[PDB]
Enzyme design. Sequence first.
Site, PDB file in Angstrom:
ATOM      1  N   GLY A  44       0.782  -1.215   0.000  1.00  0.00           N
ATOM      2  CA  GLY A  44       0.000   0.000   0.000  1.00  0.00           C
ATOM      3  C   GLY A  44       0.820   1.274   0.000  1.00  0.00           C
ATOM      4  CB  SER A  45       0.134   4.708  -1.204  1.00  0.00           C
ATOM      5  OG  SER A  45       0.474   4.526  -2.573  1.00  0.00           O
ATOM      6  N   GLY A  46       1.304   4.942   1.688  1.00  0.00           N
ATOM      7  CA  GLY A  46       1.168   5.318   3.076  1.00  0.00           C
ATOM      8  C   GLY A  46       2.262   4.799   3.997  1.00  0.00           C
ATOM      9  CG  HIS A  47       3.202   1.365   4.432  1.00  0.00           C
ATOM     10  ND1 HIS A  47       2.502   1.464   5.613  1.00  0.00           N
ATOM     11  CD2 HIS A  47       2.488   0.531   3.638  1.00  0.00           C
ATOM     12  CE1 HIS A  47       1.406   0.728   5.536  1.00  0.00           C
ATOM     13  NE2 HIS A  47       1.372   0.155   4.346  1.00  0.00           N
ATOM     14  CE  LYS A  95       4.507  -4.100   3.485  1.00  0.00           C
ATOM     15  NZ  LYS A  95       4.612  -3.955   2.002  1.00  0.00           N
ATOM     16  CG  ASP A 100       0.521  -6.692   0.987  1.00  0.00           C
ATOM     17  OD1 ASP A 100      -0.606  -6.407   1.414  1.00  0.00           O
ATOM     18  OD2 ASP A 100       1.426  -5.821   1.045  1.00  0.00           O
ATOM     19  CG  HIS A 198      -1.935  -1.952   6.686  1.00  0.00           C
ATOM     20  ND1 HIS A 198      -1.400  -3.172   6.860  1.00  0.00           N
ATOM     21  CD2 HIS A 198      -1.632  -1.535   5.392  1.00  0.00           C
ATOM     22  CE1 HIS A 198      -0.754  -3.562   5.715  1.00  0.00           C
ATOM     23  NE2 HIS A 198      -0.923  -2.548   4.878  1.00  0.00           N
TER      24      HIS A 198
END
Lengths: 336, 336
Positions: A44-47, A95, A100, A198
């Site tokens: 995901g985006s956001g990491h 991950k 994923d 998340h």
Amino acid sequence: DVLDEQLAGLAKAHPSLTLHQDPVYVTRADAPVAGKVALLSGGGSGHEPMHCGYIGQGMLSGACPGEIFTSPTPDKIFECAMQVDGGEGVLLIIKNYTGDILNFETATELLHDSGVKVTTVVIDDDVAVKDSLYTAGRRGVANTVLIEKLVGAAAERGDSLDACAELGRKLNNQGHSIGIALGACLADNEMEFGVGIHGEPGIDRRPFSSLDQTVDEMFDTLLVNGSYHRTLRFWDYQQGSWQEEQQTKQPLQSGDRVIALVNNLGATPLSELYGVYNRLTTRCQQAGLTIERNLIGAYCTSLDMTGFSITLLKVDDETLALWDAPVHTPALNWGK
Amino acid sequence: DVLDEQLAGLAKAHPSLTLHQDPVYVTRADAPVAGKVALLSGGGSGHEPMHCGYIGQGMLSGACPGEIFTSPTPDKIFECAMQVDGGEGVLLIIKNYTGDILNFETATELLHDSGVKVTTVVIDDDVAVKDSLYTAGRRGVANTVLIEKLVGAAAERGDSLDACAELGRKLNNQGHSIGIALGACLADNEMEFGVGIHGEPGIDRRPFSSLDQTVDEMFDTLLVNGSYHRTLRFWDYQQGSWQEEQQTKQPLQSGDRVIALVNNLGATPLSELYGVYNRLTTRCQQAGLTIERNLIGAYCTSLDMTGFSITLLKVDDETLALWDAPVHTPALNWGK
């Protein structure tokens, strides 16, 4: 679209990267690099900077960002792998989350069917919770970064796909992480102990008393939750099928040499991370753990979450040589 | 003491640094480096990594952290300068705040009185407010980092004290910055526009509508507040006295080539900084400014302030070569 603007910004800032469209993924500008195993990850985006900031020599050949906290779809992973394939195979680092695993595994099969030699490494370092809402087993968190660097160095050195994969799976069995949040990306002066990247719930909510006490609790948990037996599937490209493999972790123990990563989950001041590192060195020394190298900073985040994680990865001389090897990426840079 | 723990953590994390006690300051472990100009800065804690993360080859010889948002006392600065003195002079970079000026100026006189050749560079890049709470003139902010790298490269290759000082003063007249906060380190969906790095009030409080609109307002302000005439004192080591020097800045203009620094004041996610950078490139292209290099990350902070700053520094080929020159510090690392 804001994600569009953010990726465009990434591309404009770093000419060493190439942003692809239809589908979207990012690669090293010099990919495909002939004659070396290509390394790929995503999620995901956001990491940020995980995983796009880790694209470059000595690390990832490309990465596949998805929407916020959402795995990229299989087309992105397939296309990214096809673009970076240097004729020595592609290794996918995944991950451990429901999304994923599904998407990367689907892409793996699509690749195999298109004739690409591929295999996988699953990361499940978060010692806090087994079977969280979005994970079968333990969650994959910041040790992913350490493995990307180490496997990245091995691939750059010229190690075969099998050798890179075995190394990744071995390191996965030797790295242990835990995170805490003081505030999401609940009650004041209360922390989520063992939070997921998340925003998944942790072990519990408990009072924050001090930084030192929080580090002690996190460290103690790393020492006592280390033992772990579980199955992780990997793609056997010779048979063209998923292989269930029992995998074992030993607890961290006196005599172990480690690499420590003190990681900002988003909004923790660097001054505080150094305070964390100070307490961590004290506890490692008391426990007989030798910290050989460290990373302190924002390496695997969760939007603007106030919190941090600690990862300890057992290593040996060979692994330290891979750590010291050159890396040239947006987020990590060092020479010989 | 928390500060004590954080500085101990910094020292344990970086063998390339030496933490001193009685008084406290930090230097390169290899200082003093004979035959090179020594470069020093300092200021309140709470802006990490500025300035301790900039101690290393190609940058600072040492730094003097004070208490939170408080200048170090003159003894710390004096002892740090004596420790790093390599026989070719010490150059002090001072951010323009009442406390920092008073303390660094006092240390400068003490150094001169002790036979050390010293001079100074004052940084006043924040275009937002003239005569803020704790500053006569304009505040010294993130351009301080760019100047330390550039002057740091000049000192490292062997340039004289005078040449390093002249360069720093010239760059100071060419760099322009502005920051915004969404929350301090008040009202909902409101920002403090032109905030200071200690939390000083800005130009005004205004509604936050979007990231792109915020960047546009910031950029416009850099373009219109650029022109500036003021006096900055510097230490004339030949006469042993402060020299009042008129210094002039021209506004940024079409045709200018710049280094851009998009800086996290504390709790802004990296993804958002890339979005900021994307809009900034558009605005620079429209205005006729060529961005030649960039830095995007947490470089000059304000505890955990939610906000970010933009700095544009006008440069030429010579300045770009100094930027590209090797640097090896906790926060900045690159080689040839």
